[PDB]
Amino acid sequence: MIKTPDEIEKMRIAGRLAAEVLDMIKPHIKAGVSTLELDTICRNHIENVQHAIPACVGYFQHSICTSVNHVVCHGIPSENKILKNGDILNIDVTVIKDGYHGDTNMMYIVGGETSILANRLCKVAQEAMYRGMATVRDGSYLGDIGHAIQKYVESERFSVVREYCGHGIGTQVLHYGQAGTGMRLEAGMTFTIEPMVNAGVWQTKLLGDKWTVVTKDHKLSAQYEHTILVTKTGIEVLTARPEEDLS
């Protein structure tokens, strides 16, 4: 599962392009915008400016997932989903370039202001991802990631969605368990770390469209995602954004 130098170089490019989607879409996020409009802007950027491939061509009909509020993941862009101030929005994107892909998602607070709880949920979700990323280096264990995430999130009185906290990435599902469990990590491995944090119960449900996932209790959910490369001394965050403080 060790990526070659050529494979890693192509993943750096794709990861940077994916990061660029999440940064460039920011000024378009305001009250009154539909999530379909965001999808079209991202599709045009990926295909026609980056000259890359959005996920709807690789292995449905949209270039991004737009998950609002109680939607946990896989929200479908829609002309009828109109953002309003105080909404929390996750945009999830995969960019494919030259056979390799970069995967990342982040939260946006529509209008810059939201409730005490929604702000805290987003910040805890981002810090949870970072805590999981902080365990990773050559010789660490896959289980260290989920353990760090779950311990932190529950200490903050939120719930972790139990389906997964990450996946192998290339072209393996990361679960919550005990530290020291799972595969020992080696420099050159790549995967995503993407914990989903619910304000209420950890249970989710799939909507009638067999695609959109929502919290079981209709409370808020937040997620962040990075694609990471394992190194001898730590990680390289392939989807890091330039103004993103990784300390």
Compute the least distance from the CB of residue 70 to Na ion, in Å.
6
Alpha-carbon distance of 182 to 1, in angstroms, equals 14
CB-based closest residue to Na ion? 221
x/- letters, 176..215, toward Na ion (CB under 5 A): ----------------------------------------
DSSP 67: E
* Closer residue to Na ion (CB): 14 or 214: 214
- Using CB under 5 A, which of the segments 2-10, 71-79, 129-137, 235-243 binds Na ion? 71-79
Question: What does the block give as tokens for 188?
Answer: 């050159």
* Closer residue to Na ion (CB): 122 or 230: 122
Return the CA Rg of the chain: 17
* Closer residue to Na ion (CB): 71 or 161: 71
82 with 148: CB under 8 angstroms? no
* 92 marked as binding residue: yes
* 226 marked as binding residue: no
214 with 67: CB under 8 angstroms? no
* Closer residue to Na ion (CB): 22 or 235: 22
**Please, which of residues 50-69 interact with Na ion by CB under 5 A?**
67
* Closer residue to Na ion (CB): 75 or 143: 75
* 101 marked as binding residue: no
Residue with tokens 């599709």: 43
Alpha-carbon distance of 83 to 32, in angstroms, equals 5
Where helices occur in the chain by DSSP H, the ranges are: 5-24, 35-44, 116-134, 142-155
- Which residues, other chains included, contact 238 with Cβ-Cβ below 8 Å and sequence gap of 6+? 11, 12, 14, 15, 16, 102, 190, 226, 227, 228, 229
* 98 marked as binding residue: no
* Closer residue to Na ion (CB): 54 or 75: 75
Compute the least distance from the CB of residue 221 to Na ion, in Å.
4
Interaction between residue 105 and Na ion (CB under 5 A)? no
* 194 marked as binding residue: yes
CB atoms under 10 Å from CB of 52, counted, come to 22
46 with 62: CB under 8 angstroms? no
**Please, which of residues 210-239 interact with Na ion by CB under 5 A?**
221
Question: What does the block give as tokens for 20?
Answer: 């660029």
Residue numbering of the annotated binding site for substrate: 74
Residue numbering of the annotated binding site for a divalent metal cation: 92, 103, 167, 194, 225
Residue numbering of the annotated binding site: 74, 92, 103, 167, 194, 225
Binding site for Na ion (CB under 5 A): 67, 71, 221
